[PDB]
Amino acid sequence: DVWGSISDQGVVTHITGGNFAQSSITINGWLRDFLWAQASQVIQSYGSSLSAYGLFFLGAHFVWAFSL
Amino acid sequence: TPPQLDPNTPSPIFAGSTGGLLRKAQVEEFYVITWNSPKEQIFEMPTGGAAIMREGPNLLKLARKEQCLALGTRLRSKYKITYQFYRVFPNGEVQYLHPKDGVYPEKANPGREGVGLNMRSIGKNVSPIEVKFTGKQSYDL
Amino acid sequence: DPFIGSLETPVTSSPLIAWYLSNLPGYRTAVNPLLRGVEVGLAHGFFLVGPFVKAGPLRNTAYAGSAGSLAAAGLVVILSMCLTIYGISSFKEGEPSIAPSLTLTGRKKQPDQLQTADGWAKFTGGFFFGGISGVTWAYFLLYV
Amino acid sequence: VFSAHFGQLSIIFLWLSGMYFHGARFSNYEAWLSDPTHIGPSAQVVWSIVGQEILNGDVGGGFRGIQI
Amino acid sequence: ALRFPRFSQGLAQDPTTRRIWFGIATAHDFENHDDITEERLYQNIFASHFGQLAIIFLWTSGNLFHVAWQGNFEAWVQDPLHVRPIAHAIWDPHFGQPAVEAFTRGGALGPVNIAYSGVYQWWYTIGLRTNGDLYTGALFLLFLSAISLIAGWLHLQPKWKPSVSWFKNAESRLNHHLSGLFGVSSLAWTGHLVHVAIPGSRGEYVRWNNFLGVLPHPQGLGPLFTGQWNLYAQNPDSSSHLFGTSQGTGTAILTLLGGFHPQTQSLWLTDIAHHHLAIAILFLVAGHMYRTNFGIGHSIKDLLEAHIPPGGRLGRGHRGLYDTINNSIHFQLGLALASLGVITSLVAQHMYSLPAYAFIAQDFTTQAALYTHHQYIAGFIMTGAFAHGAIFFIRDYNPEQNEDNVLARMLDHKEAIISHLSWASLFLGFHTLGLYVHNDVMLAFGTPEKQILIEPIFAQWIQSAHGKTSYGFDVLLSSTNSPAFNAGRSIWLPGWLNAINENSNSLFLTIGPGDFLVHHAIALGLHTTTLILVKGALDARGSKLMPDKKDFGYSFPCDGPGRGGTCDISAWDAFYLAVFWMLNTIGWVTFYWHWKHITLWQGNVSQFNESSTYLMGWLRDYLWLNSSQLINGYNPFGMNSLSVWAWMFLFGHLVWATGFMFLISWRGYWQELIETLAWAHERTPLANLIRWRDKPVALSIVQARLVGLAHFSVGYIFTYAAFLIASTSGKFG
Amino acid sequence: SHSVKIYDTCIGCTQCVRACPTDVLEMIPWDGCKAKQIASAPRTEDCVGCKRCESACPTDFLSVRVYLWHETTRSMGLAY
Amino acid sequence: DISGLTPCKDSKQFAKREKQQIKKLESSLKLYAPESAPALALNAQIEKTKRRFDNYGKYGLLCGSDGLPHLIVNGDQRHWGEFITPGILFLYIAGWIGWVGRSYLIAISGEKKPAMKEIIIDVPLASRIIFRGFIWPVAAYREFLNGDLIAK
Ligand code: CLA
Ligand code: CLA
Ligand code: CLA
Ligand code: CLA
Ligand code: CLA
Ligand SMILES: CC1=C(/C=C/C(C)=C/C=C/C(C)=C/C=C/C=C(C)/C=C/C=C(C)/C=C/C2=C(C)CCCC2(C)C)C(C)(C)CCC1
Ligand code: SF4
Ligand code: SF4
């Protein structure tokens, strides 16, 4: 609802296009439009400068299971 | 020792709380603890909060035996005071509970009958197969 | 008694609260349980009629209120069942009442007969009749 | 307690000094100052031992490093 | 004796609510009921067996009746590859209009469910083509269930009640089970296959009203009795045969062709009949070994006692084992459970590489569901086997009668077994995790060529020994000239090699570096689960921390905070801990199978060949990629037929999380909360008129552990089933 | 009521009697030890199962053993 | 050659992978000025990649169909250096470490309170013990022959 970009004409385009007001009222929306959609960058970061983050995204998971 | 009686002993000064007696006391049983204090002092109740014990004989009503024993052991450890507690039933029967022989259990006393003694090592018990299909247990033999 | 698990507060012990609670049908000891149960059922059914017709699945159609009314009646029936079994497992045929015998002051008073097989049976019957009557009255008043 | 407080203060001061030294030596602060909008801040540089040099991303301003 | 638990007074005396909770829990432990004898226990077991048989028959009859009444069998049999089978209809007052319009599938006129059980193909293969046949089968199964119930009631009566000496007759029971239960049944199945199923496959119809006027073979029974059996294998079905029609058929009824039918991609029916005939003959021959009232045969006791090696390397040998096995029923239960688990795993591994039903290979969802179901069942059975073995050690073991036999020596050196199992588990886990992490880091840094990839040469050599020419070796069956090849070429390899050298089927799929690590992970899981169960079974009678564990029983909470604290000290806790490892291992196996088969079906095998060597590939190319269609069951815009599965998906997750609540939080907090709630209920007005009859208390320790385990397992199973079915059915490829 | 048993390996150090919170165990004269005494558990019906007596007992294995058994109002620690 | 594998110098996917890596490096290299240090670092990276690929081609590994090298643990004489020799080296090192640790434990077992020696190591004794591991196989073999290896 806040962050985004503005063209020269004066229109504002948000990062996710204002889907919070209609998709965040159900658990399936929280799982699909937030966890599934926004995790594309972290899992596809291999071979780039962000790859380290991706490795952490795995490592922490392991530690969590270890706690059990 | 001959059991005593608690006819009309007063009670300590307490303001009341929600940790007191419940329906079990009216239905099943409750406990009464009596002691004697040489001076007026403040102690801590097992149910939460602090109370003041009047000089002389004091009486208190509790719900379980564990609370009575905890209060009595605190009194003996800190104030050096002798105490005794009974159990009271709905029909009016009063049963003497604390020291039955007149002496504390930690002190050996002649004339005491032994219960639950097994004259063998703990590893001499029979296997559970030997006591199968019978109402007894291996440790009972 | 400071050694009883209860405290005295302005809310729990006030003349207004005491009078209002003692005048409720659930605390009238002298009255036979049927007349109290009738009033209790009437009030409960009249209250229960509303939400079913206001938030039911068919609340937007023309049938809505009627359907809702029916649902309310059904609930009453279930509640009546939840009463009947509670009697059967609680009170025997020949045992006397188990209500407290003495009042707060200390005066001896007759125990309530509501905690008895016949008393509870009368209470449940009156509750069922009053609930049905109240549901019918609420439906008639709302949609006539 | 007093001595432990003094030791904690010393550790905090050491951490602040380290942060300032990293900002001074290995950073693109001067390049970011002129064009703050189009340059990403960076104050850490990774060695070139194993192959971790891919972690030196193109933050901007003629510098390669980890974006802070 | 007077409350609900009439079989236990001790549980009926306490006034709390646990009297209810334990009352359901100990209803089937016949050895714990007071005033119990051997006769009553055996008779109750017999009656329970009869009831179980009746329930199974009723379930099968209900399935058949629903398929007949609300299915499309007659529409499905005509075009098997272009019709979706229907299980049963859907009636739901909560359904909206879009759901009603979207759940209508197939030729049905209303909402229906698609049957992934795979019974349509099974019933089509054996010769059912009409609804009347299904109705008749349902009626017969209902009659069988009624007969089973009647028999149970009859044998619970005093006049027909058997004695204990009857239940302990091992030789007669073994002879009868080996001769009549296994051999006669196979002979009858061979007769059915020859008489009904095969003519149905060739376009003819043979039923009860005309099966005496139709000859299964034109020659008759003459060749069988005279000796020329080869006359029954003269004219096999041609390669252009179409199932269910009289085009390109044959007359042979017993063959050894091998391979698969070209159109249906399934085994030939004549091969199945021949296999059943041979199996029945072998069982009938072998069911005559043990002695009975006729004065000839073997005695099992002498057979066991005679096997003691000279030199005393095995102690006293097998002396006293016969009485130990016969007197204890937990030993028998453990052996039967182990055998059944092995058999179930074998069935799961075999039914996907050598299918026996028509048009089932092209139905992918059925294959995946059947494999996952059977593997999970086998895992549970294998866990139960060790559980009952530990129970046997606790209860029915006599140290004096088993002096210096194999069981005593097994109990003698538990430390070496446990230490070696721990070493193997540590080795496998360490190295598998290290290799996976190294490959993941190498991929992360952008240099895939530095991976550690090791070829599974042993398995590839074994595959090449069967006649696979995708690697290069020419060993045994692969070489053109060899004793084995020349010996077998005339009969079964002409079809076997053709079937095994095709790339479409699942027979001996090609393997590479990606299967090595998964196989080692499976081995690690097996080793760790075996270590846990073996330690639990062996340390049941006692240890150094508690040398009198056998006195307390099989299940008990703990032994107090003394001696440093003793939690999870019983063997029930060992089974409890091994359940998690069993679930994890089965999950790994199912993940591997599903990913490999879905990549094979989708048309590209390079994805698995490349992305399965590191764990980020598993996380990205398997779960995240395939969940896109499943999570879109319902959206703000609308919904489709997958919606229900999506719901179930989320449902499973919830249950899983709920298990955690019972698995970390413990009893004292909840007991204090319950006390506070009881005070609150007692003090309030207008609600103190209602009073409870059983005092509310918090759950016990073992009860809470069991509840948490049940929640965990239910969530696991439901979530994986929903994901697998939705992902496999969204694409149908 | 749980079952409390005492074996003859006891040396009469009186720790178990002091550790009990519900006055279950006491001491009686005996003959086969230096301390000339041994413990006993007459008031078995008052046992709760805390196993403090086993916590305070010096021996190779405990000379006092508690086996959990049929529960009641007293052994469940209920005050309501 | 073995199990349908291709020598890594012959395979084309290896050269394709090298080309992709070089192009990916040059794509980032094109941004910076020729005299800038990042250009020198990227040129060094390119040279390292070329040297690594040349060495992998020289060593005679077998890439598969995907173009990545594979390891053979059969024991074939042509591929002993992939597994067997590092295995022998690792076994030697591990035996050294284990022998040194066991020798130190046995040496400190004599004293009255070995626990204080375990929590606070003594350096001269450990330094004397450490260098005896260079001959650990011979000592272990002789102790096994005598019978001092296994406790009784
Ligand atoms: C020859 C006659 C005979 C026969 C037929 C049986 C048969 C049976 N007895 Mg036995 N019994 C006999 C003699 C006989 N008995 C004698 C003389 C004694 C006295 C010593 C006993 C003592 C006895 C006892 C004490 C008990 C039995 C029980 C049973 C039943 C076992 C449960 C079951 O149904 O297994 C079904 C078995 C099979 C289907 C056989 C094959 C099993 C393998 C694992 C399957 C092969 C898989 C194959 C691919 C199948 C595919 C399925 C398809 C859908 C694709 C079964 C009805 C038990 C019972 O249940 O009582 C009701 C019982 O408690 N028997
Ligand atoms: C072949 C059949 C078989 C048989 C006859 C037995 C027989 C026996 N078992 Mg064994 N067992 C088996 C297989 C078998 N077991 C398997 C496969 C396992 C592994 C899971 C075990 C593990 C096992 C354990 C761990 C124990 C036994 C014990 C016992 C005895 C007690 C029975 C009882 O108390 O249950 C009555 C129990 C219940 C009615 C309550 C539990 C029901 C579960 C939690 C249901 C799961 C919930 C459901 C699926 C939810 C659906 C929700 C929906 C959304 C899907 C009994 C003699 C007990 C023993 O002490 O023996 C002396 C014991 O502790 N068994
Ligand atoms: C996914 C998380 C997880 C993991 C990794 C493990 C791991 C293990 N389990 Mg556990 N377990 C778990 C969850 C987990 N468990 C759960 C949920 C339960 C149910 C309660 C159990 C119950 C359980 C039982 C009942 C048993 C085990 C046993 C084992 C061991 C098996 C042997 C082996 O594989 O060694 C391989 C070793 C490893 C993978 C350990 C990790 C090594 C780390 C990554 C390396 C450290 C290096 C690095 C420098 C770290 C520095 C730290 C930094 C601060 C400096 C192993 C330690 C078995 C056992 O103990 O065998 C001896 C056993 O009997 N587990
Ligand atoms: C430690 C136990 C262990 C276990 C349980 C397994 C388990 C498994 N292996 Mg693995 N494997 C191991 C160690 C182990 N492996 C080792 C050390 C190697 C050499 C790198 C391999 C290489 C390997 C190959 C090449 C293949 C398997 C496959 C398999 C599966 C089939 C069994 C087999 O083929 O027999 C192989 C059994 C062994 C070689 C026994 C090893 C046991 C000793 C004690 C290990 C330690 C020895 C030591 C390191 C060797 C000397 C060093 C040398 C340098 C001188 C099965 C899942 C096969 C498969 O099915 O793949 C799909 C297959 O193709 N394994
Ligand atoms: C002092 C050297 C030492 C030695 C010779 C051994 C020897 C052995 N270990 Mg033990 N172990 C040790 C230390 C040692 N251990 C330590 C410190 C731990 C706690 C982490 C363990 C925990 C352990 C487990 C859990 C297991 C063994 C097992 C084994 C046996 C099989 C080998 C193996 O599996 O390695 C396994 C090795 C490890 C898990 C780690 C040990 C390596 C550590 C990091 C180094 C020890 C070096 C030491 C600090 C040197 C100090 C001396 C210096 C001051 C001069 C073998 C008897 C296995 C077994 O029982 O087989 C029968 C097994 O299951 N060990
Ligand atoms: C606890 C216990 C118990 C239990 C146990 C168990 C549960 C076990 C299991 C076990 C198992 C589970 C086992 C298994 C095994 C297996 C095997 C042993 C196999 C084998 C195989 C083979 C030998 C093969 C061969 C071959 C081949 C390879 C190919 C083809 C040809 C042939 C066939 C030759 C009991 C009850 C006893 C009691 C005591 C205790
Ligand atoms: S378990 Fe607790 S209450 Fe029972 S005898 Fe021991 S110390 Fe006393
Ligand atoms: S603590 Fe143990 S040894 Fe001491 S008196 Fe009690 S039972 Fe005897």
Side-chain angles (χ1 to χ4, degrees), chain A residues 22-23 26-28 31-33 35-37 39-40 42-48 51 54-55 57-58 62 64 68, chain E residues 433 440-441 443-446 614-616 619-620 624 627-628 631-636 646 649-650 653 656 660:
Chain A
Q22 211 75 70
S23 295
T26 61
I27 308 276
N28 206 33
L31 179 126
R32 171 224 312 136
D33 289 312
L35 283 200
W36 184 85
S40 308
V42 58
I43 63 188
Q44 293 159 184
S45 67
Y46 270 17
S48 166
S51 42
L55 277 165
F57 183 74
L58 283 182
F62 183 80
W64 191 75
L68 303 189
Chain E
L433 184 72
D440 220 324
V441 168
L443 257 296
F445 278 169
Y614 58 106
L615 285 162
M616 183 51 90
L619 191 72
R620 186 191 49 232
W624 182 90
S627 310
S628 36
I631 63 190
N632 256 291
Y634 55 90
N635 42 33
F649 198 56
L650 288 179
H653 277 49
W656 200 69
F660 279 35

Side-chain angles (χ1 to χ4, degrees), chain G residues 53-129:
Chain G
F53 271 82
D54 167 23
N55 272 129
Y56 275 5
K58 275 183 35 159
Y59 289 163
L61 301 106
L62 308 173
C63 328
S65 151
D66 37 355
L68 310 161
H70 286 18
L71 306 189
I72 295 275
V73 298
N74 264 7
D76 202 339
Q77 268 148 32
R78 307 171 271 195
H79 306 106
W80 262 39
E82 306 169 339
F83 181 63
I84 286 201
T85 318
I88 289 162
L89 190 44
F90 167 83
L91 288 178
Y92 182 78
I93 289 174
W96 192 329
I97 305 161
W99 202 245
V100 158
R102 168 200 206 260
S103 300
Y104 178 88
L105 269 197
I106 293 186
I108 78 171
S109 98
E111 312 234 6
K112 54 183 309 272
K113 255 198 91 152
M116 296 263 241
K117 297 277 223 203
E118 298 191 28
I119 75 160
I120 294 177
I121 316 277
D122 82 342
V123 175
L125 171 69
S127 82
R128 299 193 227 121
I129 291 283

Side-chain angles (χ1 to χ4, degrees), chain F residues 62-78:
Chain F
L62 323 156
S63 314
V64 51
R65 212 63 163 113
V66 183
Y67 314 88
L68 296 198
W69 207 227
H70 305 157
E71 318 237 341
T72 165
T73 307
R74 302 205 189 117
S75 45
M76 258 291 185
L78 295 154

